[model samples]
Target: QCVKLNDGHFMPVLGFGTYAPPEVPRSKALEVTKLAIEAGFRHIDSAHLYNNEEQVGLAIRSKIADGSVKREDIFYTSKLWSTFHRPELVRPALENSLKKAQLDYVDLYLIHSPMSLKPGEELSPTDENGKVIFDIVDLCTTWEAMEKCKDAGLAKSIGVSNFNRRQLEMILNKPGLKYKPVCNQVECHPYFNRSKLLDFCKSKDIVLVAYSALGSQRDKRWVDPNSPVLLEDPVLCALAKKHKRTPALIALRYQLQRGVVVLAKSYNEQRIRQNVQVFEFQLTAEDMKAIDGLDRNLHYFNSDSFASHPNYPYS
Candidate 1:
């Protein structure tokens, strides 16, 4: 049920993604997260950029208060935002997240993205032309700060999100690296299967935590409106019918079989309960291959705004 990180910490393979469309009320996060817990998800993935850490924290506290789960029973994940990517700002950003969550420490803390932005209260500081203001900070320097967070017990394990293989090696091969990234959290699913990155992370003993595993939430901020729906793919539908499951379940199960950690996000109560059924069925070798054939190397949540940044990952 749990995958052991390179740091020897346990992370639940099936996690709940807590990001919602910005237009939705933040209170929805608090409500859905509690529902996710009640539906049997222990790993909860969240980030400061989502701007709902306080509510997500409140949901966790409520669950704990009602005896649904204890603090240690949940594997909580929080990311250091891009605005706070500077080495000096890393720990402070983590501290701010902790303060907001009102938790002593996060089970796992990740560098939200390799790209850095101007430091400020603004999540995405912009220039007059509406272009995002980017900062050129050494990623290795930030990695060291992440290491300190682990050493200081602010986070049980440290890792990176949205990093490519080149960036990962930069940290792994640092001159005096204190700790390797325990995982690389990225937008991964059948459409953007990330086979090479998964293989590389596997070779290096780093877990590949997947977001957007059920495909894009279609949030206007991140996803293109016309992007093809992943769960609507014919291959998945056929498999779903044959196996008596939902296309979403097949998509999620595909990642689990590939040894990648998958996050499933749903605000609906019935969907949340249904998604937990991924563990109930098994996909055979042929079924796995049929799903693999559906890969188009498509990415749903590409950050085109930051494409010009030197460390832009998708490029």
Candidate 2:
């Protein structure tokens, strides 16, 4: 099930997310990605910062060459890292991704985050000096270049990630903009439903793509151990048992029923196979209401330290 993007390209409603640490061997990553394609995943989301685009490309190309899948059937997405935010560096950044992914063009490309730091400098959420290290040019200038990517036939569509409603409005209002963002990627799950932002995107016809669908339990660096576990919630467990499915399935189905694209991450083959089974079932209206009630407005990766920034999402 592919959702039609504003640019006329279709993206799989369920996609595989590759965000594991750079230290994880590429062989492991390639094996996992190959398994994901075999399990019928038509979309694979990756980024330059993850430093595994080459491996992902290898697995994807292998599958394509073997006739297991066609390149057009897979909606491959990649992001431009913060270091490439300078206007002059934008196309070079995308070209680097193209070389790594072994693709002539990408289906969709995105600006990884709204914030940016100088090239080679790390922008931690909690920097030692508490400086808000950001350059507005990174977004506007990068966006301008993104449009050029589409114009130059390097990418089919362009969008922004980790942006809030206010930031989106700013981009939409930019003068002489040749292309509009087709989607916004954000951390969404049963716990952090994000009704307002989702509704705004819906009204504007901008697709919403969800990351951290299973609550990012494996991402301990950004996850709060104290936060309630989404997979262990009593309501979700009961519903899963009633539906004869796993808690993860029920959670992914909830988002699909809400008309949002979901990206489920896992290096484990069994779990990755199970994550794409979301399209096999349907959630009733009553089930949707029940799931909606489970929202506690909790954010597993709250960029709280950016509160002072002008376009901070949570502020």
Candidate 3:
């Protein structure tokens, strides 16, 4: 039901993703997050960039107010945005979120992306001509500040997102390292299962936390809309029928059985309730193999907007 991180903290294997399109009202996150909690999701993944921490926090408080769960019963993760990657800004960035959520500290805090943006109010700082500004900050230094955040108890666990093998190694092999990352959050699903990275993380005793486990949100800005829909894959569909589950459940089960921590995002009330059933069934080794065969090394959230940055993980 829960996996212990390298830091001795427990994180629920299944996390409820709270990202909604900009067009969607912030209230929707509050509503769906409450619904997700009611449906038995103990892990909640959110980011400062999502700009809905207050509403999500309110939902959690309301749930606690009604005795649905206590503060420790939930595992909440918040991410530090690119604009706050500098060492000095790290704690303030996390504090800002805590202030917004009216919570003491987040269960986990992740560097939202490897690339850093120029320090400013804008999440994605841009030039006068509207070109995105990129800053050159050594991630090792950022990680040091992240370690300070842990020392300060702003976050129970610390990790990175969208980092490649070499980047992880850089942190792992950093001289005088105080603490290693407990996890790496990335885009992973049947289509882009990240087999190589998953194995590497396992070898290093770091958990692989998967986002976009159901393909993705398909937002035009971050994801390629033309990519094949993962939930519609014939292999998954067949397994779903064999197991008497939805293809989405089959996809989620595939990750769970693979030892990957998966996040399932669904604003739909029915889908939110249905996602909890991922634990109700099991996928055989043969079924898992068939699902593994669906891997095409594809990615939905490619983070192409940051491709020009020096620390671009995919490159």
Candidate 4:
């Protein structure tokens, strides 16, 4: 089953997350994506910032050529990078993503973050202090350009990622609101559930898409080495054993049962194939409540570098 979007499109309740750490060696985006499709994942998430659009495009095409599914069968999402926040550059940036992915248009396009960067430069244009240069784009200006993209048929739907409630309200309350976001992609797990933000989006008829749903893969370059692991949690492991399910599958099922869309990222061939088993089992209320108690508000992706930006989002 799929979650119906306010924009009138439906996204699979479970999809594939494509972000990987630099340690992953920048290859096999095609192999993994094709494998994911073969494993029954219909939605393929990617971004220009990820620098693997070409490979993702190749994988989608490979699937079609083999007679598995058509382009319309997949829900492809791409993000607008920080450097392309200028309204005029929005279409070009999305066009660049489309160009690389060899697609006519994206299923959903998002603002990478509320924080904008200097336009038309290499990703993360930095100043001498080694800080990311900030661009002064307001949420609505960026939202307006996103609206234009939807109007022009470049993106079937538009949304934002990592946006706080106030940031969402800015666009919802725009003087001449054309569209509200169809979803909000954020870091979610039993820990750092963002329940408040999730409720806010629900009230607005917006879908909450969970990323890092199993918690971070602990990319050493970004995540602190001392962080507690989510999959290894004693409670989750015990519950997994009780249900005779893998910890990752339990977590994915939990989110889906809670009426949220989930993104599962795994390069392991077996794990990717196994992730689709969520539909095979149901979580009992007692067990779902047990999983719900795991919240501790721990965020694994909070980088201090963007903490001081004017549009900085985070508690």
Local accuracy by lDDT, each model = 0.91, 0.84, 0.92, 0.89
The C-alpha TM-scores of every prediction are 0.98, 0.93, 0.97, 0.97
Off by over 4 Å in 4: none
Minimal lDDT window, size 10, model 1 = 301-310
- The lDDT, on a scale of 0 to 1, for candidate 1 is 0.91
Tens digit per residue, CA lDDT, model 4, 171-256: 89999999889999988898877889989999999998999998878876557777788899887898889889989988999899
Indicate the worst ten consecutive residues by lDDT in candidate 4.
19-28
Q: Number of the top candidate by lDDT?
A: 3
Candidate 2: tens digits of C-alpha lDDT, residues 1-315: 888888888888998988787567777878989999999888899998787899999989999999999888988899987667787878888898999989999888998887765565353433458764555553767889999999998888899898999888888888887788999999899988988999999998899999888888445555667889899998899899989999999999998988899998889988998987788888889988988998888878754445555545664
TM-score of 1: 0.98
lDDT for each residue of candidate 3 in 220-283, tens digit (9 for 90 to 100) = 8877777999988999888889888999999899899999999999999999999999999999
- What residue pairs clash in candidate 1, if any at all? none
- Runs of candidate 3 with Cα error greater than 4 angstroms are none
Candidate 2 or 1, higher TM-score: 1
Q: Return the lDDT, model 2, position 124.
A: 45
Scored by lDDT, model 4 comes in at 0.89
